[PDB]
mmCIF file of all heavy atoms in Angstrom:
data_model
loop_
_atom_site.group_PDB
_atom_site.id
_atom_site.type_symbol
_atom_site.label_atom_id
_atom_site.label_comp_id
_atom_site.label_asym_id
_atom_site.label_seq_id
_atom_site.Cartn_x
_atom_site.Cartn_y
_atom_site.Cartn_z
ATOM 1 N N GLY A 1 0.766 -1.230 -0.006
ATOM 2 C CA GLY A 1 -0.001 0.004 -0.004
ATOM 3 C C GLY A 1 0.807 1.296 -0.001
ATOM 4 O O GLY A 1 0.231 2.370 0.116
ATOM 5 N N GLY A 2 2.119 1.191 -0.131
ATOM 6 C CA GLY A 2 3.031 2.337 -0.157
ATOM 7 C C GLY A 2 3.633 2.667 1.193
ATOM 8 O O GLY A 2 3.259 2.083 2.216
ATOM 9 N N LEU A 3 4.607 3.608 1.170
ATOM 10 C CA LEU A 3 5.374 4.031 2.354
ATOM 11 C C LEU A 3 4.516 4.316 3.606
ATOM 12 O O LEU A 3 4.830 3.758 4.660
ATOM 13 C CB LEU A 3 6.267 5.232 2.020
ATOM 14 C CG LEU A 3 7.159 5.747 3.173
ATOM 15 C CD1 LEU A 3 8.173 4.677 3.654
ATOM 16 C CD2 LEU A 3 7.908 6.948 2.744
ATOM 17 N N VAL A 4 3.475 5.166 3.514
ATOM 18 C CA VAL A 4 2.633 5.577 4.626
ATOM 19 C C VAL A 4 1.956 4.351 5.280
ATOM 20 O O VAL A 4 1.989 4.196 6.501
ATOM 21 C CB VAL A 4 1.627 6.728 4.249
ATOM 22 C CG1 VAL A 4 0.631 6.975 5.381
ATOM 23 C CG2 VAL A 4 2.389 7.998 3.939
ATOM 24 N N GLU A 5 1.421 3.430 4.458
ATOM 25 C CA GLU A 5 0.800 2.196 4.938
ATOM 26 C C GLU A 5 1.832 1.290 5.640
ATOM 27 O O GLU A 5 1.463 0.665 6.644
ATOM 28 C CB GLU A 5 0.114 1.454 3.808
ATOM 29 C CG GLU A 5 -1.308 1.026 4.138
ATOM 30 C CD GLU A 5 -2.181 2.120 4.723
ATOM 31 O OE1 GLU A 5 -2.444 3.135 4.032
ATOM 32 O OE2 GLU A 5 -2.527 2.015 5.930
ATOM 33 N N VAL A 6 3.070 1.188 5.138
ATOM 34 C CA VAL A 6 4.093 0.358 5.747
ATOM 35 C C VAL A 6 4.473 0.933 7.121
ATOM 36 O O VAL A 6 4.659 0.177 8.085
ATOM 37 C CB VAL A 6 5.338 0.224 4.794
ATOM 38 C CG1 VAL A 6 6.542 -0.432 5.511
ATOM 39 C CG2 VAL A 6 4.952 -0.559 3.523
ATOM 40 N N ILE A 7 4.555 2.304 7.238
ATOM 41 C CA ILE A 7 4.851 2.965 8.496
ATOM 42 C C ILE A 7 3.688 2.757 9.503
ATOM 43 O O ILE A 7 3.950 2.357 10.639
ATOM 44 C CB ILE A 7 5.137 4.467 8.275
ATOM 45 C CG1 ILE A 7 6.448 4.672 7.480
ATOM 46 C CG2 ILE A 7 5.175 5.266 9.604
ATOM 47 C CD1 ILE A 7 6.721 6.098 6.948
ATOM 48 N N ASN A 8 2.417 3.009 9.058
ATOM 49 C CA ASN A 8 1.223 2.893 9.895
ATOM 50 C C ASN A 8 0.973 1.457 10.331
ATOM 51 O O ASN A 8 0.590 1.235 11.463
ATOM 52 C CB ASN A 8 -0.018 3.448 9.180
ATOM 53 C CG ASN A 8 -0.051 4.953 9.022
ATOM 54 O OD1 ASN A 8 0.556 5.729 9.759
ATOM 55 N ND2 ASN A 8 -0.842 5.399 8.070
ATOM 56 N N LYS A 9 1.153 0.470 9.409
ATOM 57 C CA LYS A 9 0.906 -0.941 9.734
ATOM 58 C C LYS A 9 2.141 -1.620 10.366
ATOM 59 O O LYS A 9 2.021 -2.783 10.795
ATOM 60 C CB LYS A 9 0.434 -1.730 8.487
ATOM 61 C CG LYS A 9 -0.929 -1.270 7.998
ATOM 62 C CD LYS A 9 -1.421 -2.096 6.833
ATOM 63 C CE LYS A 9 -2.738 -1.589 6.305
ATOM 64 N NZ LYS A 9 -3.720 -1.345 7.379
ATOM 65 N N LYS A 10 3.286 -0.916 10.502
ATOM 66 C CA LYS A 10 4.563 -1.396 11.093
ATOM 67 C C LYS A 10 4.992 -2.684 10.389
ATOM 68 O O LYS A 10 5.115 -3.746 11.010
ATOM 69 C CB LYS A 10 4.403 -1.575 12.613
ATOM 70 C CG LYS A 10 4.181 -0.298 13.397
ATOM 71 C CD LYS A 10 4.073 -0.574 14.884
ATOM 72 C CE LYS A 10 4.131 0.706 15.702
ATOM 73 N NZ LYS A 10 4.097 0.394 17.151
ATOM 74 N N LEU A 11 5.269 -2.596 9.071
ATOM 75 C CA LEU A 11 5.575 -3.760 8.231
ATOM 76 C C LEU A 11 7.050 -3.819 7.789
ATOM 77 O O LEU A 11 7.343 -4.557 6.863
ATOM 78 C CB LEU A 11 4.672 -3.758 6.983
ATOM 79 C CG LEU A 11 3.198 -4.058 7.201
ATOM 80 C CD1 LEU A 11 2.398 -3.767 5.947
ATOM 81 C CD2 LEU A 11 2.995 -5.530 7.622
ATOM 82 N N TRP A 12 7.968 -3.116 8.441
ATOM 83 C CA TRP A 12 9.368 -3.065 8.057
ATOM 84 C C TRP A 12 10.086 -4.422 8.149
ATOM 85 O O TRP A 12 10.916 -4.707 7.283
ATOM 86 C CB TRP A 12 10.131 -2.009 8.839
ATOM 87 C CG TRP A 12 9.762 -0.622 8.403
ATOM 88 C CD1 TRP A 12 9.095 0.309 9.128
ATOM 89 C CD2 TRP A 12 9.918 -0.056 7.078
ATOM 90 N NE1 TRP A 12 8.878 1.461 8.365
ATOM 91 C CE2 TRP A 12 9.363 1.235 7.093
ATOM 92 C CE3 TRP A 12 10.454 -0.569 5.870
ATOM 93 C CZ2 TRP A 12 9.340 2.053 5.979
ATOM 94 C CZ3 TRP A 12 10.436 0.259 4.748
ATOM 95 C CH2 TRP A 12 9.881 1.550 4.802
ATOM 96 N N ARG A 13 9.739 -5.281 9.112
ATOM 97 C CA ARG A 13 10.299 -6.631 9.244
ATOM 98 C C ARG A 13 9.909 -7.493 8.043
ATOM 99 O O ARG A 13 10.718 -8.322 7.595
ATOM 100 C CB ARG A 13 9.884 -7.301 10.577
ATOM 101 C CG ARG A 13 10.625 -6.776 11.775
ATOM 102 C CD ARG A 13 10.559 -7.679 12.989
ATOM 103 N NE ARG A 13 11.729 -7.497 13.861
ATOM 104 C CZ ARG A 13 12.570 -8.457 14.231
ATOM 105 N NH1 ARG A 13 12.359 -9.706 13.864
ATOM 106 N NH2 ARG A 13 13.612 -8.175 15.020
ATOM 107 N N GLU A 14 8.719 -7.302 7.512
ATOM 108 C CA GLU A 14 8.225 -8.025 6.316
ATOM 109 C C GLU A 14 8.984 -7.536 5.058
ATOM 110 O O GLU A 14 9.296 -8.362 4.220
ATOM 111 C CB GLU A 14 6.707 -7.804 6.135
ATOM 112 C CG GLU A 14 5.868 -8.462 7.232
ATOM 113 C CD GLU A 14 4.628 -9.133 6.714
ATOM 114 O OE1 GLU A 14 3.813 -8.467 6.027
ATOM 115 O OE2 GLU A 14 4.450 -10.353 6.984
ATOM 116 N N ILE A 15 9.255 -6.228 5.008
ATOM 117 C CA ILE A 15 10.003 -5.622 3.893
ATOM 118 C C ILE A 15 11.467 -6.152 3.939
ATOM 119 O O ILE A 15 11.955 -6.604 2.888
ATOM 120 C CB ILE A 15 9.930 -4.075 3.940
ATOM 121 C CG1 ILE A 15 8.456 -3.566 3.907
ATOM 122 C CG2 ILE A 15 10.774 -3.470 2.832
ATOM 123 C CD1 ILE A 15 7.519 -4.048 2.660
ATOM 124 N N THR A 16 12.104 -6.119 5.119
ATOM 125 C CA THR A 16 13.493 -6.618 5.386
ATOM 126 C C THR A 16 13.583 -8.116 4.958
ATOM 127 O O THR A 16 14.523 -8.476 4.257
ATOM 128 C CB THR A 16 13.871 -6.440 6.863
ATOM 129 O OG1 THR A 16 13.673 -5.072 7.219
ATOM 130 C CG2 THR A 16 15.303 -6.801 7.130
ATOM 131 N N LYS A 17 12.612 -8.924 5.398
ATOM 132 C CA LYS A 17 12.494 -10.371 5.031
ATOM 133 C C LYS A 17 12.373 -10.519 3.496
ATOM 134 O O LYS A 17 13.052 -11.338 2.920
ATOM 135 C CB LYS A 17 11.241 -10.952 5.744
ATOM 136 C CG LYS A 17 11.127 -12.460 5.673
ATOM 137 C CD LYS A 17 9.972 -12.976 6.517
ATOM 138 C CE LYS A 17 9.732 -14.420 6.186
ATOM 139 N NZ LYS A 17 9.241 -15.207 7.353
ATOM 140 N N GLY A 18 11.511 -9.713 2.913
ATOM 141 C CA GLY A 18 11.286 -9.666 1.470
ATOM 142 C C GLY A 18 12.484 -9.307 0.654
ATOM 143 O O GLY A 18 12.580 -9.672 -0.506
ATOM 144 N N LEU A 19 13.445 -8.586 1.282
ATOM 145 C CA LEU A 19 14.698 -8.182 0.675
ATOM 146 C C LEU A 19 15.804 -9.225 0.924
ATOM 147 O O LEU A 19 16.973 -9.001 0.577
ATOM 148 C CB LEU A 19 15.145 -6.800 1.197
ATOM 149 C CG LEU A 19 14.423 -5.571 0.625
ATOM 150 C CD1 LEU A 19 14.906 -4.318 1.328
ATOM 151 C CD2 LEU A 19 14.636 -5.409 -0.879
ATOM 152 N N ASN A 20 15.449 -10.368 1.566
ATOM 153 C CA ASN A 20 16.336 -11.480 1.942
ATOM 154 C C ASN A 20 17.429 -11.007 2.875
ATOM 155 O O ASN A 20 18.609 -11.423 2.780
ATOM 156 C CB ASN A 20 16.868 -12.195 0.690
ATOM 157 C CG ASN A 20 17.544 -13.512 0.946
ATOM 158 O OD1 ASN A 20 17.066 -14.338 1.721
ATOM 159 N ND2 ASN A 20 18.698 -13.718 0.301
ATOM 160 N N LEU A 21 17.106 -10.099 3.823
ATOM 161 C CA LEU A 21 18.011 -9.539 4.818
ATOM 162 C C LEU A 21 17.594 -9.934 6.214
ATOM 163 O O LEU A 21 16.355 -9.970 6.442
ATOM 164 C CB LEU A 21 18.102 -8.016 4.726
ATOM 165 C CG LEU A 21 18.581 -7.386 3.404
ATOM 166 C CD1 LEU A 21 18.203 -5.960 3.341
ATOM 167 C CD2 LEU A 21 20.052 -7.547 3.214
ATOM 168 N N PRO A 22 18.494 -10.212 7.190
ATOM 169 C CA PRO A 22 18.070 -10.556 8.555
ATOM 170 C C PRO A 22 17.225 -9.414 9.144
ATOM 171 O O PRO A 22 17.649 -8.260 9.023
ATOM 172 C CB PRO A 22 19.398 -10.723 9.309
ATOM 173 C CG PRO A 22 20.383 -11.036 8.267
ATOM 174 C CD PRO A 22 19.979 -10.231 7.083
ATOM 175 N N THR A 23 16.052 -9.719 9.707
ATOM 176 C CA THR A 23 15.124 -8.722 10.265
ATOM 177 C C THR A 23 15.748 -8.059 11.505
ATOM 178 O O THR A 23 15.401 -6.918 11.795
ATOM 179 C CB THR A 23 13.754 -9.321 10.594
ATOM 180 O OG1 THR A 23 13.894 -10.303 11.614
ATOM 181 C CG2 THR A 23 13.085 -9.929 9.372
ATOM 182 N N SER A 24 16.677 -8.758 12.192
ATOM 183 C CA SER A 24 17.360 -8.345 13.397
ATOM 184 C C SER A 24 18.510 -7.340 13.147
ATOM 185 O O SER A 24 19.194 -6.991 14.117
ATOM 186 C CB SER A 24 17.860 -9.540 14.191
ATOM 187 O OG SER A 24 18.503 -10.493 13.379
#
């Protein structure tokens, strides 16, 4: 849903995972 939705829904760990990067 775009940047604002990722910030509001707190989806950065899903984005990090999606980029094949450790979420930690």
Side-chain angles (χ1 to χ4, degrees):
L3 182 61
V4 172
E5 230 47 66
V6 170
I7 293 168
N8 290 335
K9 294 184 184 313
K10 294 181 169 183
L11 289 170
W12 288 113
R13 283 199 154 235
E14 292 221 305
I15 303 303
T16 306
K17 190 174 168 147
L19 283 177
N20 191 44
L21 301 163
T23 64
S24 46

